[PDB]
Design a protein around this ligand. Structure first.
Ligand SMILES: Nc1ncnc2c1ncn2[C@@H]1O[C@H](COP(=O)(O)OP(=O)(O)OP(=O)(O)O)[C@@H](O)[C@H]1O
Ligand SMILES: Nc1ncnc2c1ncn2[C@@H]1O[C@H](COP(=O)(O)OP(=O)(O)O)[C@@H](O)[C@H]1O
Ligand SMILES: Nc1ncnc2c1ncn2[C@@H]1O[C@H](COP(=O)(O)OP(=O)(O)O)[C@@H](O)[C@H]1O
Ligand SMILES: Nc1ncnc2c1ncn2[C@@H]1O[C@H](COP(=O)(O)OP(=O)(O)O)[C@@H](O)[C@H]1O
Lengths: 24, 544, 265, 456
């Protein structure tokens, strides 16, 4: 009864793209 | 060409190979798609629809409309590709690999110009190839889609169209929502009749025309977790897949799908067995093996179940809505447990909502869920979540006289319309349940009730709730002659809890008339009587 | 499907490395009934954790070798698949998706694969999110056309929270309810498994041990289910006998139950 | 060959490169229970960061070469270990079938190498996690939990740790050329459970006699004793050396009598009966109730400084408006045992904080705190002993202004009459009226200010 649910959204755990180090 | 083949599947080449099943109907829907695809700018349709209504089947109908040439000339010789967005994210570890793969797709589409790029699950486009520092595949396609230089069909669930395309309001502009609706039942029969040869060939069974007519009407009436142009194919398959199973031809008929649907929801929809028909005609007598001496209720709950099993029930009302009135202890819950025993073989197969645990409305949220924002929203309702799992289920609203005046008003929608939307937002069906309302109920100078107990239900319930109850049954108080019959039931099955060396209690003596007397009063029920049989002759003849 | 992310349960069943499955013959027929469908042939095994849901499929993988197939499940290899093992090792983009598109490429080329994925609560959200590319977006086009036969396994709560709350995932996995077995069914499980436990521990397990293991486990243990809490008692008692060394009875499985639960004697 | 990727524990065990552990035999036995099973034959060794999990398997490797072992684990090897060489080494484990790998970071294999184990088992695996990491990673993967068994490794007690130091005695007498005594190792364990809370015993005590032997072989360029482990513990915790615990308390506690003197003497005897002599440590030390004085928070500040910690080890928990929750007492004692715990309110009567306060943790001080026709607490002189404290903060700031706040005894008497609000009336009268005189330079540096207040 009128106890509110508090969604509490997480920060985005997401992928990462890459700069790569060039080699021969 | 070769770039599109490794990032997606050609549906036009799949329609030449006959790998796409026939799409019977959806002529006005594919016409709407080809109308949107023939635009100059924003020629991008989205098949929004309920999940399973044939959103990706409309595009399969388009891919075999191109091969048949039933498209207009502006869409003739188009190559319709299901763009695999996972194929583009695949092997994109480094920065700019995904954005290279997507611009290589679009360079081939601008080169050929005969590409309609069907993106199934268009909600996955927002965030496709989105990394820490990347460009999502939405923002690469947004200049293409707005100018109409990229023909792209989307297909998105209406639930998944709120959360990911209406949360990206720029991308919603670039598309046109083509509402693929849930078809009617007569349209679904033509879908099923058109898919007759595909499921004849894979299940090696002939499927008759009445079986197609059944599995559309049986799915619409008795299945609610899915949509028509799918839950009807679902009954055709597990019909024919059982015939591949049990035979390791046999026709699929009305009986072959009703036995699937009986093993599907637990709703007996059978074309009735003669052995099942006999025990339904003597249902009033086979419920006399647990309760005795009612003879008005046990007949009137037998009339409602035969009305259900003969198919003559109102398909928008419940299978039976009852009030079990009368004094306490006369077999109110014992009839509901008997009614659950006849229909399931289990006395705890019913759903007993104890209405004495409710007295106000500010705890009345366990039977229709909590509204959004409030706690109890993701596990909303204990009545609803048990009825959408057992749609055929006797539910028992025990002790309704100890409840609130405004909690049976939530169930007032259940009695007429047979539905109840929980707090989560989901309509559950009570159209096949058997609703039971158990109630515990002369004074002065009169020359010598049924009349006052109707007036006292008119005091407690509103006459609008009683208006929607199908049968109101006042129970007759147990005569001292039939308490002789009542104690004979306890010496058999409650003495069947006993072990058969630890007892010899079926004596046939005259002392059961004394057991019939001890434990019963004209104000008490037979519960203060079923306790005295246990603790005086059964449970103390057993501890030695 | 490679042996990197799972193993071939039919090749294990051909070599006889899987557990003998006594009981659950009716549930295997319901899995074969869902797998014999032309579309949506995806049986999710809904049951409490450790009721024998893999033991349904281990018996199903034997039934491929034993020839109890409906001729549409004939010579179908059944690679199990840890869905979380594809997740493991993904911090960068296209790590999960490449290893998922590889294992779906090795099904179209090979052509007889029946995936057994456990943990379908992991399916929703296997990638970043649902708007992102997850395994609950890659599998779904092939789970509606019958071109991908995946056998699932949820609990009942994971099925309610993750699949019944997911639109367009209820319709692609068809529920097969693997129930909680009774006490006599559990003994018959133990009667079939005893040729493995008496040959692994090199002990002899008496008939009195199993009638006690199916009774004492229900009587004292409530956080975990029967067709596992009863298998465990005659497993550790064979190991405790191998450690103390041989015959397991209702006294040898007795002190094994007393090790865990807070019983001094 | 696998010696060039990982290394043996059994070849190290026979040579003597592994140190023995004297206790921990129920935990090694539990591992041999788990591995001898047909299914779930892989122990996970749930422990804590330091309690000794690798210590079980390097003692298990000693059990192989000795023979206090099952014959299903007799003559076996315990190794301790990109995709192409990972499959290369696990093929060498499969083609023998007689070797077992150990992983100290098993939670980092599902955080693959996890379902590689299943056709290579058809190999064994001994894992090592913490109890946090077992809940995060091992329990989450359901296809992993079918093969692994939760094997508990708990924190050892102090008398158990002395046995461990007894076994790890010849290792340090040989390494540092030092002669360590029994007293030292008793004090190196009973002060390791005491003063160190970022680590756990098995290590907290071994770190002391390792550094003590390192301190002896340093400053001589003899003998570690009781007085070494305190100064070795002195710099290594930043605490100066005062750690003999004369019985328990003394009058030093009752020096800072910030108020009622009979209260301070009553609290003094109350813990000297519950710290040494009686009160088994399965119930926490202290465990007494305040009565409804000064305000009682300042009295508990002297309690924390004198026995366990500084004033920071006193924790004020309010329950005046925190009585609808499930809690900060659990977290702050988790970081620091031997905590002096203070509950400022107990008169808020509810059934939720009833439950949180029954179950309370082996060593922590727990504290709970006019219409008639009628003519018939600190006293008058006991306010004056708090007045000079609450102006010492004012005079302590005027010394940098080259001033000395001298209060006459009559002005302190009236300041007792007007002043919990004794703090505020000094800020209103002694501070604010003086500060405007400092800005006016009526008083200033080179002046000893004398605030007399007549009409007292
Ligand atoms: N008009 C139709 N004619 C023939 N078959 C149809 C038609 N509509 C639907 N179907 C069939 O019913 C099923 C519907 O699944 P489909 O994926 O096509 O629909 P959907 O609503 O887009 O589902 P999802 O959202 O899961 O992709 C398929 O087997 C499809 O072939
Ligand atoms: N019709 C009946 N036939 C046989 N026994 C009955 C019958 N009705 C009641 N009893 C017995 O008397 C008890 C009275 O309980 P019942 O009237 O069923 O519950 P309630 O009063 O809560 O509706 C039952 O539990 C059963 O043991
Ligand atoms: N007929 C059977 N039913 C259930 N479990 C069985 C059966 N035969 C063997 N088992 C045991 O079941 C276990 C396999 O795990 P399983 O019970 O399938 O887990 P889950 O039910 O959580 O999927 C093994 O201990 C195996 O020996
Ligand atoms: N029972 C014991 N006997 C001897 N040394 C032990 C014992 N337990 C732990 N140690 C020592 O404690 C240190 C930590 O080892 P271990 O407990 O395996 O670490 P971790 O807790 O990080 O797994 C090592 O020097 C080890 O030899």
């Amino acid at each position: 009864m009128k106890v509110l649910i508090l969604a509490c959204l997480v920060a985005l755990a997401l992928a990462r793209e890459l700069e790569e180090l060039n080699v021969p | 060409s070769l770039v599109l083949d490794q990032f997606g599947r050609n549906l036009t080449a799949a329609a030449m190979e006959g790998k796409l099943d026939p799409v019977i109907g959806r002529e006005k829907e594919i016409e709407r798609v080809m109308q949107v695809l023939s635009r100059r700018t924003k020629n991008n349709p989205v098949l929004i629809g309920e999940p399973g209504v044939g959103k990706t089947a409309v595009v399969e109908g388009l891919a075999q409309a191109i091969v048949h040439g039933e498209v207009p000339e502006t869409l003739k010789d188009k190559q319709l590709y299901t763009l695999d967005l996972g194929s583009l994210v695949a092997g994109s570890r480094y920065r700019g690999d995904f954005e290279e793969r997507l611009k290589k797709v679009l360079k081939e589409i601008n080169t050929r110009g005969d590409i309609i790029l069907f993106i199934d699950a268009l909600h996955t486009l927002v965030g496709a190839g989105a990394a820490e520092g990347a460009i999502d595949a939405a923002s690469i396609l947004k200049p293409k889609l707005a100018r109409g230089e990229l023909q792209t069909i989307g297909a998105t669930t209406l639930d998944e169209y709120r959360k990911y395309i209406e949360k990206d309001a720029a991308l919603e502009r670039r598309f046109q929502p083509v509402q693929v609706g849930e078809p009617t039942v007569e349209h679904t029969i033509e879908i099923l009749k058109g898919l007759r040869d595909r499921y004849e060939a894979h299940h090696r069974v002939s499927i008759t025309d009445a079986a197609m007519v059944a599995a559309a009407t049986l799915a619409d009436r008795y299945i609610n977790d899915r949509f028509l142009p799918d839950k009807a194919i679902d009954l055709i398959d597990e019909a024919g897949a059982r015939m591949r199973i049990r035979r390791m031809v046999a026709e699929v008929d009305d009986e072959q799908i009703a036995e699937v649907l009986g093993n599907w929801t637990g709703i007996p929809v059978f074309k009735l067995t003669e052995a099942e028909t006999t025990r339904l005609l003597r249902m009033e007598e086979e419920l006399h093996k647990r309760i005795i001496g009612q003879e008005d209720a046990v007949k009137a709950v037998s009339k409602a179940i035969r009305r259900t099993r003969a198919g003559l029930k109102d398909p928008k009302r419940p299978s039976g809505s009852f009030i079990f009135a009368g004094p306490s202890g006369v077999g109110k819950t014992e009839l509901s447990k008997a009614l659950a025993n006849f229909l399931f073989g289990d006395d705890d197969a019913l759903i007993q909502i104890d209405m004495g645990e409710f007295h106000d409305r500010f705890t009345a949220s366990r039977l229709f869920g909590a509204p959004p924002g409030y706690v109890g929203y993701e596990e909303g309702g204990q009545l609803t979540e048990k009825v959408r799992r057992k749609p055929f289920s006797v539910v028992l609203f025990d002790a309704i006289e100890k409840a609130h005046q405004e909690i049976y008003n939530s169930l007032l929608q259940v009695l007429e319309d047979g539905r109840l939307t929980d707090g989560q937002g989901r309509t559950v069906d009570f159209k096949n349940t058997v609703l039971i309302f158990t109630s515990n109920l002369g004074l002065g100078f009169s020359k010598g009730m049924k009349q006052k107990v109707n007036d006292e239900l008119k005091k407690h319930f509103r006459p609008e709730f009683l208006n929607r109850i199908d049968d109101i049954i006042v129970f007759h108080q147990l005569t001292r002659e039939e308490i002789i019959r009542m104690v004979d039931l306890m010496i058999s099955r409650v003495a069947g809890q006993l072990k058969s060396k630890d007892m010899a209690l079926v004596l046939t003596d005259a002392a059961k008339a004394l057991l019939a007397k001890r434990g019963f009063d004209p104000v008490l029920g037979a519960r203060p009587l079923r306790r005295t049989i246990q603790r005086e002759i059964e449970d103390q003849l057993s501890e030695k």
